[PDB]
Amino acid sequence: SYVVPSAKLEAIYPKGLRVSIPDDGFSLFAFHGKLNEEMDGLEAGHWARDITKPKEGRWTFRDRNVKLKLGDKIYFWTYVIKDGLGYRQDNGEWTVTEFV
Ligand SMILES: OC[C@H]1O[C@@H](O[C@@H]2[C@@H](O)[C@H](O[C@@H]3[C@@H](O)[C@H](O[C@@H]4[C@@H](O)[C@H](O[C@@H]5[C@@H](O)[C@H](O[C@@H]6[C@@H](O)[C@H](O)O[C@H](CO)[C@H]6O)O[C@H](CO)[C@H]5O)O[C@H](CO)[C@H]4O)O[C@H](CO)[C@H]3O)O[C@H](CO)[C@H]2O)[C@H](O)[C@@H](O)[C@@H]1O
């Protein structure tokens, strides 16, 4: 019913991944994703992590170590708890087009 804010993904140079969303009175944010490999629905994913506090208005997940390449695909879903209830951005797809 409620629509989760779309995730913003960023390929960091020379290495790393950041994934974040603005907060909307949430109590948790989780990111589930794979590298160049499609998700079979709500599988856990290669990256699979609960984030438990926001900072500067955003919920941020990072992998400080992945070396991403132009053209890399990330398939994902996110999960958010708002007022004790869960919501998902489903069927996420992102292509690395630039580094930040
Ligand atoms: O110590 C024991 C054990 O603990 C584990 O750690 C816990 C940890 O895994 C947990 O992490 C949270 C995670 O579970 C949660 O995942 C949810 C997921 O549960 C949800 O799954 C749904 C099912 O709920 C649903 O079941 C249906 C049910 O709702 C309905 O009422 O009845 C149906 C019966 O007819 C039943 O089928 O079925 C659907 C499939 O159709 C599932 O998809 O899905 C959501 C996504 O929608 C998913 O997010 O997410 C939380 C937030 O990210 C996680 O934090 O957290 C616990 C702490 O709170 C931990 O204790 C360990 O892993 C084990 O090793 C330990 O032994």
CSV table of C-alpha atoms and ligand atoms in Angstrom, one decimal:
chain,number,residue,atom,x,y,z
A,1,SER,CA,0.0,0.0,0.0
A,2,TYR,CA,2.7,2.4,1.1
A,3,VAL,CA,5.5,2.8,-1.5
A,4,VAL,CA,9.1,2.5,-0.3
A,5,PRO,CA,11.5,5.3,-1.5
A,6,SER,CA,13.5,4.0,-4.5
A,7,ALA,CA,17.1,3.0,-3.5
A,8,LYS,CA,19.9,5.2,-4.7
A,9,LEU,CA,23.0,3.1,-5.7
A,10,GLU,CA,26.5,4.4,-6.1
A,11,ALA,CA,29.7,2.8,-7.5
A,12,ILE,CA,32.6,4.4,-5.5
A,13,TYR,CA,36.1,4.7,-7.2
A,14,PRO,CA,38.4,3.0,-6.9
A,15,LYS,CA,36.3,0.5,-4.8
A,16,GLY,CA,33.0,0.1,-2.9
A,17,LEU,CA,29.2,0.2,-3.1
A,18,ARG,CA,26.8,2.4,-1.3
A,19,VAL,CA,23.1,1.9,-1.3
A,20,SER,CA,20.7,4.3,0.5
A,21,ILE,CA,17.2,5.7,0.9
A,22,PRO,CA,15.8,8.8,2.6
A,23,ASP,CA,14.2,8.1,5.9
A,24,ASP,CA,10.4,8.3,6.5
A,25,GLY,CA,10.0,7.4,10.2
A,26,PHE,CA,11.3,3.9,9.5
A,27,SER,CA,12.7,1.6,12.2
A,28,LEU,CA,15.0,-0.6,10.0
A,29,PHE,CA,16.3,-0.8,6.4
A,30,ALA,CA,17.6,-3.9,4.7
A,31,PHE,CA,19.3,-4.5,1.3
A,32,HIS,CA,19.5,-7.7,-0.6
A,33,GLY,CA,21.5,-8.0,-3.8
A,34,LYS,CA,23.6,-10.0,-6.3
A,35,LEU,CA,26.3,-9.0,-8.8
A,36,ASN,CA,25.6,-9.7,-12.4
A,37,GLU,CA,23.2,-12.4,-11.3
A,38,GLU,CA,19.4,-12.2,-11.2
A,39,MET,CA,17.4,-12.7,-7.9
A,40,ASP,CA,14.9,-15.6,-7.7
A,41,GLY,CA,12.3,-13.5,-5.9
A,42,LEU,CA,12.9,-12.8,-2.3
A,43,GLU,CA,16.2,-14.7,-1.9
A,44,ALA,CA,18.6,-13.4,0.7
A,45,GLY,CA,21.3,-12.4,-1.9
A,46,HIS,CA,25.1,-12.1,-1.8
A,47,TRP,CA,24.8,-8.8,0.0
A,48,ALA,CA,22.2,-9.2,2.8
A,49,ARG,CA,22.3,-6.8,5.6
A,50,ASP,CA,20.0,-5.0,8.1
A,51,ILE,CA,20.7,-1.3,8.8
A,52,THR,CA,19.5,-0.2,12.2
A,53,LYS,CA,19.8,3.6,12.4
A,54,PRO,CA,19.7,6.5,9.9
A,55,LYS,CA,22.3,9.3,9.7
A,56,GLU,CA,21.8,12.7,8.1
A,57,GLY,CA,18.3,11.7,7.0
A,58,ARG,CA,19.3,8.6,5.1
A,59,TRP,CA,19.6,4.8,5.7
A,60,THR,CA,22.9,3.7,4.1
A,61,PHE,CA,24.3,0.3,3.4
A,62,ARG,CA,27.9,0.0,2.2
A,63,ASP,CA,30.3,-2.6,0.9
A,64,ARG,CA,33.7,-0.8,1.3
A,65,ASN,CA,35.5,-3.5,-0.8
A,66,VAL,CA,33.7,-4.5,-4.0
A,67,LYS,CA,35.6,-3.4,-7.1
A,68,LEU,CA,32.7,-2.6,-9.5
A,69,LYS,CA,33.2,-2.2,-13.3
A,70,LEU,CA,31.4,0.0,-15.9
A,71,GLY,CA,28.5,-2.2,-17.1
A,72,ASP,CA,28.1,-4.2,-13.9
A,73,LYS,CA,24.5,-5.1,-13.1
A,74,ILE,CA,23.1,-5.2,-9.5
A,75,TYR,CA,19.8,-7.1,-9.0
A,76,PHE,CA,18.1,-6.4,-5.7
A,77,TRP,CA,15.2,-5.8,-3.3
A,78,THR,CA,15.0,-3.7,-0.2
A,79,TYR,CA,12.9,-3.9,3.0
A,80,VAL,CA,11.7,-1.3,5.3
A,81,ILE,CA,9.8,-1.3,8.6
A,82,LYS,CA,7.4,1.6,9.2
A,83,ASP,CA,5.0,1.6,12.1
A,84,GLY,CA,5.8,-2.1,12.8
A,85,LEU,CA,4.9,-3.2,9.2
A,86,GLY,CA,7.2,-4.3,6.4
A,87,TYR,CA,7.4,-2.9,2.8
A,88,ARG,CA,9.6,-3.7,-0.1
A,89,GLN,CA,11.1,-2.2,-3.2
A,90,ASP,CA,10.8,-5.2,-5.4
A,91,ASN,CA,12.5,-6.2,-8.7
A,92,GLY,CA,15.4,-3.7,-8.5
A,93,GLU,CA,17.9,-3.4,-11.3
A,94,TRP,CA,20.8,-1.0,-11.6
A,95,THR,CA,23.7,-0.7,-14.1
A,96,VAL,CA,27.0,0.9,-13.3
A,97,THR,CA,27.3,3.9,-15.7
A,98,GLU,CA,29.5,6.2,-13.6
A,99,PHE,CA,31.7,6.3,-10.5
A,100,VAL,CA,31.4,8.8,-7.6
B,1,LIG,O1,17.7,-17.9,17.1
B,1,LIG,C1,16.9,-18.4,16.1
B,1,LIG,C2,17.5,-18.2,14.7
B,1,LIG,O2,17.5,-16.8,14.5
B,1,LIG,C3,18.0,-16.3,13.2
B,1,LIG,O3,18.2,-14.9,13.3
B,1,LIG,C4,17.0,-14.1,13.2
B,1,LIG,C5,17.0,-13.3,11.8
B,1,LIG,O4,16.9,-14.2,10.7
B,1,LIG,C6,15.9,-12.3,11.7
B,1,LIG,O5,16.2,-11.6,10.5
B,1,LIG,C7,15.0,-10.9,10.1
B,1,LIG,C8,14.4,-11.7,8.9
B,1,LIG,O6,13.8,-12.9,9.5
B,1,LIG,C9,13.3,-10.9,8.2
B,1,LIG,O7,13.0,-11.7,7.1
B,1,LIG,C10,11.7,-11.4,6.6
B,1,LIG,C11,11.1,-12.7,6.4
B,1,LIG,O8,10.9,-13.3,7.7
B,1,LIG,C12,9.8,-12.7,5.6
B,1,LIG,O9,9.5,-14.0,5.3
B,1,LIG,C13,8.2,-14.3,4.8
B,1,LIG,C14,7.5,-15.2,5.8
B,1,LIG,O10,7.2,-14.4,7.0
B,1,LIG,C15,6.1,-15.7,5.3
B,1,LIG,O11,5.6,-16.6,6.3
B,1,LIG,C16,4.2,-16.6,6.3
B,1,LIG,C17,3.6,-15.8,7.5
B,1,LIG,O12,3.8,-14.5,7.3
B,1,LIG,C18,2.1,-16.1,7.6
B,1,LIG,O13,1.5,-15.5,8.8
B,1,LIG,O14,1.9,-17.5,7.7
B,1,LIG,C19,2.2,-18.2,6.6
B,1,LIG,C20,1.8,-19.7,6.8
B,1,LIG,O15,0.8,-19.9,6.0
B,1,LIG,C21,3.7,-18.1,6.3
B,1,LIG,O16,4.1,-18.7,5.1
B,1,LIG,O17,6.2,-16.3,4.0
B,1,LIG,C22,6.9,-15.5,3.0
B,1,LIG,C23,7.0,-16.4,1.8
B,1,LIG,O18,5.8,-16.4,1.1
B,1,LIG,C24,8.2,-15.0,3.5
B,1,LIG,O19,8.8,-14.2,2.4
B,1,LIG,O20,9.9,-11.9,4.4
B,1,LIG,C25,10.4,-10.6,4.6
B,1,LIG,C26,10.3,-9.9,3.3
B,1,LIG,O21,9.0,-9.7,2.8
B,1,LIG,C27,11.8,-10.6,5.3
B,1,LIG,O22,12.3,-9.3,5.5
B,1,LIG,O23,13.7,-9.6,7.9
B,1,LIG,C28,14.2,-8.8,9.0
B,1,LIG,C29,14.5,-7.4,8.5
B,1,LIG,O24,15.4,-7.4,7.5
B,1,LIG,C30,15.4,-9.5,9.6
B,1,LIG,O25,16.0,-8.7,10.6
B,1,LIG,O26,16.0,-11.5,12.8
B,1,LIG,C31,15.8,-12.1,14.1
B,1,LIG,C32,15.9,-11.0,15.1
B,1,LIG,O27,14.8,-10.1,15.1
B,1,LIG,C33,17.0,-13.1,14.3
B,1,LIG,O28,16.8,-13.7,15.6
B,1,LIG,C34,19.3,-17.0,12.7
B,1,LIG,O29,19.6,-16.8,11.4
B,1,LIG,C35,19.3,-18.5,13.0
B,1,LIG,O30,20.6,-19.0,12.7
B,1,LIG,C36,18.9,-18.7,14.5
B,1,LIG,O31,19.0,-20.1,14.8
